[PDB]
Amino acid sequence: KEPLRPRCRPINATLAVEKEGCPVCITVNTTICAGYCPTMTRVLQGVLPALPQVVCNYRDVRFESIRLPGCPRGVNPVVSYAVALSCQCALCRRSTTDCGGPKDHPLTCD
Amino acid sequence: QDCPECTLQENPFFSQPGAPILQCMGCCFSRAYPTPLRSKKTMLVQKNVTSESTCCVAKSYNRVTVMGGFKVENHTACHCSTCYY
Numbered sequence: 001k002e003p004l005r006p007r008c009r010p011i012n013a014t015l016a017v018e019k020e021g022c023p024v025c026i027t028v029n030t031t032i033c034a035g036y037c038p039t040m041t042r043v044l045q046g047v048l049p050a051l052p053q054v055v056c057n058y059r060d061v062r063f064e065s066i067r068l069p070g071c072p073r074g075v076n077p078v079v080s081y082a083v084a085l086s087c088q089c090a091l092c093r094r095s096t097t098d099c100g101g102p103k104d105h106p107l108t109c110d
Numbered sequence: 111q112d113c114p115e116c117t118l119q120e121n122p123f124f125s126q127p128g129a130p131i132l133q134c135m136g137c138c139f140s141r142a143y144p145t146p147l148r149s150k151k152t153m154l155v156q157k158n159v160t161s162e163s164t165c166c167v168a169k170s171y172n173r174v175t176v177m178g179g180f181k182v183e184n185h186t187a188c189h190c191s192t193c194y195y
């Protein structure tokens with residue numbers, strides 16, 4: 001069936017692809033990472049460091065690309081998007097990930 | 111697999127009979143995707159992936175000392191909220 005709270009896994013979604021210079025945003029199909037991760041704040045007061053929250057994240061990324069339509073003269077038209085081979089609950093690595101929270105459906109053209 | 115709902119749990123190490131220490135523990139939702147170009151033009155440090163999440167956090171708790179020392183807190187209600195840092 002469908003877990004109700006399916007744990008962090010690759011899910012199909014559509015990435016909007018855009019490049020400035022090119023007139024058309026192509027919405028490609030790929031796999032993003034989505035699901036649930038077990039997390040829990042300390043009840044015990046006075047501990048350090050702060051137990052950081054694990055988050056749904058990529059594990060094994062393969063890349064694909066497309067050529068955007070209508071680009072001009074010497075603009076490069078091949079934009080590449082990521083494809084989630086696997087996902088995993090892990091530290092939202094701030095150096096490499098933009099760690100935040102919910103946004104009203106972010107992968108649409110714009 | 112399926113992950114367990116964010117809900118109160120019995121902290122089995124701070125809980126004494128007649129007086130359980132409750133702890134919010136569970137699963138919430140998070141998604142990770144290639145950061146939108148839109149996002150890229152607003153960030154100073156480009157980061158290739160954008161993570162959106164919520165963590166199992168106490169909507170309400172009670173600062174309470176216990177077992178002699180232990181300054182602990184009693185999670186009274188749970189929810190999927192900010193993962194903070």
Ligand SMILES: *[C@@H]1O[C@H](CO)[C@@H](O)[C@H](O)[C@H]1NC(C)=O
Nearest residue numbers: 058061082083096144158159
């Ligand atoms: C994110 O960036 C890191 C470093 O370049 C790379 O290893 C990883 O595969 C990238 N993932 C995605 C989803 O773009």
Ligand SMILES: *[C@@H]1O[C@H](CO)[C@@H](O)[C@H](O)[C@H]1NC(C)=O
Nearest residue numbers: 128129130131132174184186
């Ligand atoms: C913790 O909170 C629960 C519910 O509010 C209560 O029943 C329990 O007795 C409390 N325990 C302590 C040690 O205060």
